[PDB]
Design a protein around this ligand. Structure first.
Ligand SMILES: Nc1ncnc2c1ncn2[C@@H]1O[C@H](CSCC[C@H](N)C(=O)O)[C@@H](O)[C@H]1O
Ligand code: NA
Lengths: 265, 265
């Protein structure tokens, strides 16, 4: 009678940790959600084959609305696993599900896996220099989210980097590209006119982290807004004040304009 | 002709990903470093047996100073693996190593693994609310660092959480406990008098992340300062204002006092 929250990792089925695999293999029932993120290098079939268990995929409503009606009942008499892309508690509200587990009298354990939040280290930007993070959400009809723009502003004033998770509407197979993110930000700049995000802003794009050849690119918005970064998922990063060593990596590894090597001191 | 940076994960030998284990097994040479951080729940012997190949350990000097003389030459005609605790390149210095690989004409790839940066999600604190991160280092001789205090102040002021890594003496396998960190902070507060860290400050301590049974505790400094958090490593977090769900998670999962539900939300 235990519930395991198990992360599947960044890109493919092998991004799960050995610990995660061995526990999932011995579970009686296995549930999963594939709406919080996109694992571009695998399929449900491959994941199922790897763990040797049939997987019951749940929708966002199944989880947010009926997690205690669909998953917890079985977890009271058996070992149940709930799998998720990346790390199960990063950039999701799944932590709250552990509260539901407890009140249901069910023990829960968490098995971590590589997460985009941590994988940003491959951009060469010091991970401790990141400040508040935000999500660039798709506008729904006339509703136009803009809060993420203020996050960039606040971090940049402190000289901190801003990690921008990008939207995903899995049910519609809609995966926001870094390009779409940039467009939205420029539009928001037009409204707020804070000088936060412009054609000259230096940005970093990380696409398909977890794969062997992720797309790592740095440059000015004017130049990257129309560049092809490959298949989703993508994340966008607006660096704050760079250290020379960060700029060197972006130039040498992410093909950034050598001019950034000359920071303004 | 290829160098693989492979993350070992959080705590024990099973914290490496399936992909990492499989790639390491196919490499002609396997190196590892245990100076940036340690794998507190396992040993070099257990990691080596799991992989099945002899592992050569590299000192801080061997890497920072002679990576291109010890590691890269072999990567020219063989597949080489470089294992590091956590997620590769999270340690502010390892990114540079990819530039060295480039300059040696050696291809390098990164195989991710869980990191403390993402793993803290288990505290129930929303990762988007984390601000600039810092490390608390022991004062030594005429050097008494206090910058981490300012980091906490700037984050909390903006309602952001502060992730604090605690000092470590890797070679000696000696870690600074959360209790020591809290003591240091109280002394810095006495000097600073900024009202940033006092007996009434709410803090979160995370011990042995990666383990199925990590210690997750939250409470006011005056009550946790002398609490036994178990074996290191310890992670100290100074949360900013809490979302009601974060507070409920802390109360329900980390044994936080009911008081935070009205005082810190
Ligand atoms: N492999 C990957 N490469 C680039 N961005 C990724 C990614 N995986 C996730 N993301 C980013 O994060 C968003 C999901 S938000 C939740 C992330 C997940 N729990 C994790 O720990 O990684 C995606 O829409 C995308 O913008
Ligand atoms: Na951070």
């Amino acid at each position: 009678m235990v519930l395991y929250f198990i992360g599947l990792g960044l890109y493919d089925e092998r991004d799960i940790t050995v610990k995660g695999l061995e526990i999932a293999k011995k579970c009686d029932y296995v549930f999963a959600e594939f709406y919080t993120s996109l694992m571009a290098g695998t399929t449900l079939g491959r994941i199922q084959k790897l763990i040797g268990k049939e997987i019951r995929v749940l929708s966002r409503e199944d989880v947010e609305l009926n997690f205690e009606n669909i998953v917890l009942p079985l977890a009271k008499e058996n070992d149940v696993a709930f799998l998720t892309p990346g790390d199960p508690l990063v950039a999701t509200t799944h932590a709250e599900l552990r509260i539901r587990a407890k009140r249901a009298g069910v023990e829960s354990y968490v098995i971590h896996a590589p997460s985009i939040y941590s994988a940003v280290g491959i951009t060469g930007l010091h991970i401790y220099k990141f400040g508040k993070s935000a999500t660039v959400a798709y506008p729904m009809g006339n509703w136009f989210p803009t809060s993420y723009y203020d996050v960039i502003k606040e971090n940049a004033e402190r000289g901190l980097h801003t990690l921008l998770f990008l939207d995903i509407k899995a049910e519609k197979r809609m995966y926001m590209t870094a390009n779409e993110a940039m467009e939205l930000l420029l539009k928001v700049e037009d409204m707020k006119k804070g000088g936060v995000f412009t054609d000259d802003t230096l940005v970093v794009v990380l696409a398909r982290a977890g794969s062997l050849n992720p797309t790592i690119r740095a440059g000015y918005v004017k130049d990257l807004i129309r560049e092809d970064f490959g298949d989703p998922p993508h994340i966008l990063i607006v660096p704050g004040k760079l250290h020379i060593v960060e700029a060197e990596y972006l130039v040498e590894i992410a093909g950034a304009p050598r001019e950034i090597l000359r920071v303004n001191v």
